[PDB]
Amino acid sequence: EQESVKEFLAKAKEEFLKKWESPSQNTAQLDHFDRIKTLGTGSFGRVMLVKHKETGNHYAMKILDKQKVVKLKQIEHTLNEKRILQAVNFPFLVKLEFSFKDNSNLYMVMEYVPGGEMFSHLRRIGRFSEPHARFYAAQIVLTFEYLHSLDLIYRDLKPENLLIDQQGYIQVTDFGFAKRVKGRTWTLCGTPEYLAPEIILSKGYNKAVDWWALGVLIYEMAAGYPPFFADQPIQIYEKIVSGKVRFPSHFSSDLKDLLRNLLQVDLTKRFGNLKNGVNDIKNHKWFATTDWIAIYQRKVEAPFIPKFKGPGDTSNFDDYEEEEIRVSINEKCGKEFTEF
């Protein structure tokens, strides 16, 4: 069984590296799709629900204005994100189906995840019970086992980036901060509530920041609010580095013990960063009832299934004013995006 995990990850790395070295490009075009509705705001343009004309399949299409990407100095991040998305393959990662570009825009067409993001569900429901939180947490644990085995650090875990699919399972989205990192890296990035102390303290850091963020996520899912919050980020940062955390009285002893070991300011003590790696987390008492293989196969009954009345249902997304998508008659920023 342990040998089965090693074999799986070795094959996953072989597959990843092939696609990483020889990325796909230009695998569809804009007039293969009908635009249906704006699903959300993307970093550089709309995220659209679209319908593939030949198949009738629905997808989420991210539209990125090339001139805006260049203006905000995000060329490398944008190229890197697409390069990652086209190379990875794991059940709890969003799936890039097509990508292409035209005179004005870059396009990433993903599998449409109709439940929207976890954040809204969590704020509506208030908090998740520990079984419910554990179901989601187990998926993140496996996803980080996968990503870290590829030397990818994720760096933006938060409920805002966890989409819920029709079966109630997670698909992680937004790889804008993800980086291939075998050793240390130094960029200040992430979301204040989820930053590990060593990021705040301007140290070189490693994949252990993702395991800290898992602790924050588990805490927020189970409490309904994050462990460190304040009016302004600077006050949040003061709490994060302080070494102090308080738990709701309804947290189980097992939950508190796991969280003390993930929200560990001392890197030499933090679960996920020790000699036994991810297995310190997977073997912890809080996860004793978790069937890791059944989770990976999506065989566990989900605690929550989002409303979804057939393909094209957008009831889990906000409404946005619809504007025409204008493509210039002249190419913009061609050289910068040759690799896309």
């Binding site: 954040f119 704020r123 933006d156 938060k158 805002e160 804008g176 901060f177 200040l188 990035c189 992430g190 979301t191 204040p192 509530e193 409490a223 309904g224 609010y225 994050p226 919050f229 304040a230 009016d231 308080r246 709701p248």
Partner: peptide, 18 residues
């Protein structure tokens, strides 16, 4: 309560990076 303090923080909505 801690929950009331969270509401008072003004950071109950979706959170941007950086």
């Amino acid at each position: 309560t801690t929950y009331a303090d969270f509401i008072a923080s003004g950071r109950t909505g979706s959170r941007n990076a950086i």
